Every structure is written in structure tokens, then in C-alpha cells.
Design a binder for this molecule. Structure first.
Ligand SMILES: CN1C(=N)N[C@@]2(c3ccc(-c4ccc(F)c(C#N)c4)s3)CN(c3ccccc3)C[C@H]2C1=O
Length: 390
């Protein structure tokens, strides 16, 4: 592990998001910021809000610069509106550098800040193409790389606890690591396997095969990436295109058929509980996603366990049972490899080489009989045909 200053710098959980501490302004104002590989704006609360105990106060920063322009982001998971500007930004448990970056000061919002959560802003780590209002607003990481000698790469280790963390626990527990500018070998086991970044906007990738307990879902691979497949730390679930979700759930139900679960469980709405320690992990199947490799006609697979796709939740009766929600859900905007997927792996966003690497995470939850895996290579033909074009 060569990046000790950044190891264990994240806090949070899949249902709340994972955040890192950052400072903005002069003198520095500390804020907790959600790490989001699914967007490209650095946006922070900049006005009082019932669910925030602190916010960016531009009038107290001597280095604040007003861009005299607004920004409006429509409902996705809450909507917000703000004013653009720039200021000096740093990451305390990060690279020892300070950079001038764009900041969207959020002044009005709806269903964006969450009651009970501990983050006050979001750090969009994707590319300029999807930045708002348009691609002229340079994202934070681009600024960081342009202004310093930090390598054009970051890596994320999101650590699910495997059980519920209460209010106090989630604040005191280490939720993972965001290594800025490098790869820390203490965070994974085995080898790193890389898949190409198909296009630089979201972190888009191409899935070429899907298995449920080794059984091929057998769909035209284009369906797996309709209309795109992305890696998104800002999404809790593994989200799959409608048709794929339908086929996958049928197969997961069949594999776990020795126990019947209500429709509400498969819809991700209701929890299921078992007596303490008796969760029947073994009846649930492993899920493997094969990704295009860097070599022609070669692919590799990442395999997750039910310990990744069943999200631990507190029982309504705060009993002693072990309860969970099914964290695979449908999407009309493509596959989203969210926290569910990311908690099983150390993920390397190698922007410099336009590729994303995966290795088994040193903090993934498993049991004595099965473990998450990253394996290859496999011979796979016509993988380009798996990508979707509008
Ligand atoms: C899926 N997703 C996302 N990855 N980022 C955004 C998020 C807003 C709130 C998020 C949130 C809140 C609580 C949580 F627990 C988790 C998790 N996990 C995530 S993610 C920012 N965004 C966006 C930003 C700027 C311009 C355009 C779009 C599009 C939003 C969105 O729908």
C-alpha cells in the first residue's frame, strides 16, 4: 500500500452513498462530499437547509470568484438549482495539493439532500460531456490534473459492512478508500483486469455475457448494454435494462426456489428477514458479468455474491433478525453498476489509458464457501456488436 494518506478516507454505505472530506475557500471550509462517478459537477449546499448542518458560505471566502451564471439540474434523484463560481479546493486525506475549481453553489433544492445523511455536496468524477449547464464547465478532476502533477487516474474501494450500521456507527466506521492519482495494492487481492472505457462521458463499458450460477442468461448481448452500461458510485443498486432485469430475476428466483419470497421483495420495496445468523446465502446464486477485455476477442468476468446484491437493512421492529432488501432493479436508461457491484471490487478509473480495472476487494463481504472473483481470459467473439448505437 503506497497511498497510506488516502486509504480509509471514505465514510457511508450503499443506501446513503459514500463521501470524502473536502475543503473549499479561504480560510478552508470543511464539507463532506459524495463521490459520484455518475455525474461531472462539483456541487455543494450553499444556503441553509433543514437537512444540512453546514454549507458553503461564499461571503466568507476571500478566494471566491462569481461566474455570474446559474445552473439548473432537473429531477433525477431530487433536483437542485445553483450559482456557478470558482474557489480553491482541497482534499485533506488526499493529494497534498490545492486547486482552483468550478463549484456550483446550491441555493434551492428538492428531494436532493437526505434527512439523516451526512454529506453536504457531490463530487462528479465523470467527463465534461455530461457536465451542466454544458461541457464548457471543467469538472473537478480535469482541473486537478491540469493544475498539478497528479496522475490522471483514481481508484475506489467502497466497503459494505455486511450488516446494518446505525446512526452513530455509520459516522464512526471506515467506509472505504478513494485513491487520487494511483492504485493501492493493499486494497485488493489477485489480479486487476481491465475493460475499455467505450466513450468518455459517463464511465461507459460493454458487458458481453451474463451468468446466474454459471447458467448463461443467453440474451443478445446488445440487450445488456441498451442503451448504455456505466459504472456509477452514485447509484445504490445494480440496475439492469427492463428485458434483462426480467430474465435475470426469473433466473435468480429459479435458483433460490427452495424459499419463496413476496413480489414486493423482488421489486426492491420490501425487506426479508431471517433469524440472526441464519441468512441462507447458499440458496442464492452468484452473478457474473463478462466485460470486454483489452485484447482482441478476449473478455474477463467479475462475479458477485448475494452478500453484495442483498443490501443489509434494519428491521422495522429493530429486532435481532438479519434483514435485507433486494438491490437489483430495473432501468430504462441502461445498465448501472452501482454500489452493489462496486462493494465487491476495487475499481480503477484509469482515465489516462481509457480503461477501468477490477480486482477482488479486500473488504468485500463473503462466507466460508464462496468469494467474489475477477477471472480471465475467455475467448469472446464480435464483442463490438454488444455495444448499442442510437
Ligand atoms: C444516479 N445519479 C448520480 N449518479 N448522480 C446524481 C446524484 C444525486 C443524488 C445522489 C445520491 C443521493 C443519496 C444517495 F444515497 C446516493 C447513493 N448511492 C446518491 S446521486 C447527480 N446527478 C447530476 C449532477 C449534475 C448534473 C447532472 C446530473 C444525477 C444524479 C443521479 O441520478
Amino acid at each position: 500500500g503506497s497511498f497510506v494518506e488516502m486509504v480509509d478516507n471514505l465514510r457511508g454505505k450503499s443506501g446513503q452513498g459514500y463521501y470524502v472530506e473536502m475543503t473549499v475557500g479561504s480560510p478552508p471550509q470543511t464539507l463532506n462530499i459524495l463521490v459520484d462517478t455518475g455525474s461531472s459537477n462539483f456541487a455543494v449546499g450553499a444556503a441553509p437547509h433543514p437537512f444540512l448542518h453546514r454549507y458553503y458560505q461564499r461571503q466568507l471566502s476571500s478566494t471566491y470568484r462569481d461566474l455570474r451564471k446559474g445552473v439548473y439540474v432537473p429531477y433525477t434523484q431530487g433536483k437542485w438549482e445553483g450559482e456557478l463560481g470558482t474557489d480553491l479546493v482541497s482534499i485533506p486525506h488526499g493529494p497534498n495539493v490545492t486547486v482552483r475549481a468550478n463549484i456550483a453553489a446550491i441555493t434551492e433544492s428538492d428531494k436532493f439532500f437526505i434527512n439523516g445523511s451526512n454529506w453536504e455536496g457531490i463530487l462528479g468524477l465523470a467527463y465534461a460531456e455530461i457536465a451542466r449547464p454544458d461541457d464548457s464547465l471543467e469538472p473537478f478532476f480535469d482541473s486537478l490534473v491540469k493544475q498539478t502533477h497528479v496522475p490522471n487516474l483514481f481508484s475506489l474501494q467502497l466497503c459494505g459492512a455486511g450488516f446494518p450500521l446505525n446512526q452513530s456507527e455509520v459516522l464512526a466506521s471506515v467506509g472505504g478508500s478513494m485513491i487520487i492519482g494511483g492504485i493501492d495494492h493493499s486494497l485488493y487481492t489477485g489480479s486487476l483486469w481491465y475493460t475499455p472505457i467505450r466513450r468518455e462521458w459517463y464511465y461507459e463499458v460493454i458487458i458481453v455475457r451474463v451468468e446466474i450460477n454459471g447458467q448463461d442468461l443467453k440474451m443478445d448481448c446488445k440487450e445488456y448494454n441498451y442503451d448504455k452500461s456505466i459504472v456509477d458510485s452514485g447509484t445504490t443498486n445494480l440496475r439492469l435494462p427492463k428485458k434483462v432485469f426480467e430474465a435475470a430475476v426469473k433466473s435468480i428466483k429459479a435458483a433460490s426456489s427452495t424459499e419463496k419470497f413476496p413480489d414486493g421483495f423482488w421489486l426492491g420495496e420490501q425487506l426479508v428477514c431471517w433469524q440472526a445468523g441464519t441468512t441462507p446465502w447458499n440458496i442464492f446464486p452468484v452473478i457474473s458479468l463478462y466485460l470486454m477485455g483489452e485484447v482482441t476477442n478476449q473478455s474477463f468476468r467479475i462475479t458477485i455474491l448475494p452478500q453484495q446484491y442483498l443490501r443489509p437493512v434494519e428491521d422495522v421492529a429493530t429486532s435481532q433478525d438479519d434483514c435485507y432488501k433486494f438491490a437489483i432493479s430495473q432501468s430504462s436508461t441502461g445498465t448501472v453498476m452501482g454500489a452493489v457491484i462496486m462493494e465487491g471490487f476495487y475499481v480503477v478509473f484509469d482515465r489516462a489509458r481509457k480503461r477501468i480495472g477490477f480486482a477482488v476487494s479486500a473488504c468485500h463481504v463473503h462466507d466460508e464457501f464462496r468469494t467474489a472473483a475477477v477471472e480471465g481470459p475467455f475467448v469472446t467473439l464480435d464483442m463490438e456488436d454488444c455495444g448499442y448505437n442510437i
